[PDB]
């Protein structure tokens, strides 16, 4: 009963948006449908995180902080994964009932943010990331953004990261079968993790903007609670993105 096999079992099932393309296609409807889907996905992510060996050893405040700080990264990474598997990174596969065409991206209100999200999936395509590699990296993303003032249970947190860095090693081996150039693979995946801060930064920016200036878009309570809590901290520059390479 390995750690990686447990990560396979606790991985949330792909959710359906219930998007109704019989209705008129508007910007407000799409972003509200995506927000509602996102709220539900975040709920699943909380359940997922609680089932990660080690996560519950952390102080409850640390648990909240990590989820509040990384939720967007987890969602965008998963979206990148789905899009890679479902269409080889050619389409944004938010849900099996909400798949965005190349032609549907050519709309002014969503071209820019779609291009940002496609870049993530194209990294999966470029690196031919395996399922176990993806799962290990996703854990590490949950553990990649912290407060500058630090954490309440730092030592536990440091041991968790250590545990899942090793698991990522196993995922690399399980895929390649013990090469002498596995260090290059590890380097490439840590570089991808690092670049997730930048690739997601512009997504959070547009999200925060939409939430504050209500440019009328609906946010479910799950997202509203995290965003409004997360908002003042980013503006204060109080968040520390952890990076493997300086």
């Amino acid at each position: 009963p390995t750690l990686i096999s447990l990560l396979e079992v606790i991985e949330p099932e792909v959710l359906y948006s219930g998007y109704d393309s019989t209705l008129p296609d508007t910007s407000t409807r799409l972003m509200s449908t995506l927000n509602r889907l996102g709220g539900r996905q975040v709920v699943s992510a909380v359940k997922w995180a609680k089932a990660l060996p080690g996560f519950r050893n952390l102080h409850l405040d640390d648990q909240m902080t990590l989820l509040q700080y990384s939720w967007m990264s987890l969602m965008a990474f998963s979206l990148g994964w789905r899009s890679y598997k479902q269409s080889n990174g050619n389409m944004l596969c938010f849900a099996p009932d909400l798949v965005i065409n190349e032609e549907r991206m050519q709309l002014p209100y969503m071209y820019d943010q779609c291009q940002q999200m496609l870049k993530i999936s194209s990294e999966f395509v470029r690196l031919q990331v395996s399922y176990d590699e993806y799962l290990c990296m996703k854990v590490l993303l949950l553990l990649s953004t912290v407060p500058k003032d630090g954490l309440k249970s730092q030592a536990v947190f440091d041991e968790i990261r250590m545990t899942y860095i090793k698991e990522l090693g196993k995922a690399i081996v399980k895929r390649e079968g013990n090469s002498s150039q596995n260090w290059q693979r590890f380097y490439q995946l840590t570089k991808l993790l690092d670049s997730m801060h930048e690739m997601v930064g512009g997504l959070l920016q547009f999200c925060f903007y939409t939430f504050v200036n209500k440019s009328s878009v609906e946010f479910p309570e799950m997202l509203a609670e995290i965003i409004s809590n997360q908002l003042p901290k980013f503006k204060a520059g109080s968040v520390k993105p952890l990076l493997f390479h300086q």
């Binding site: 909380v46 359940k47 609680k50 409850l60 648990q63 909240m64 799950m222 609670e225």
Partner: peptide
């Protein structure tokens, strides 16, 4: 806040 606190404690 309250909703995240709930989800972490539940089950």
């Amino acid at each position: 806040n309250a909703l995240l606190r709930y989800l972490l404690d539940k089950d």
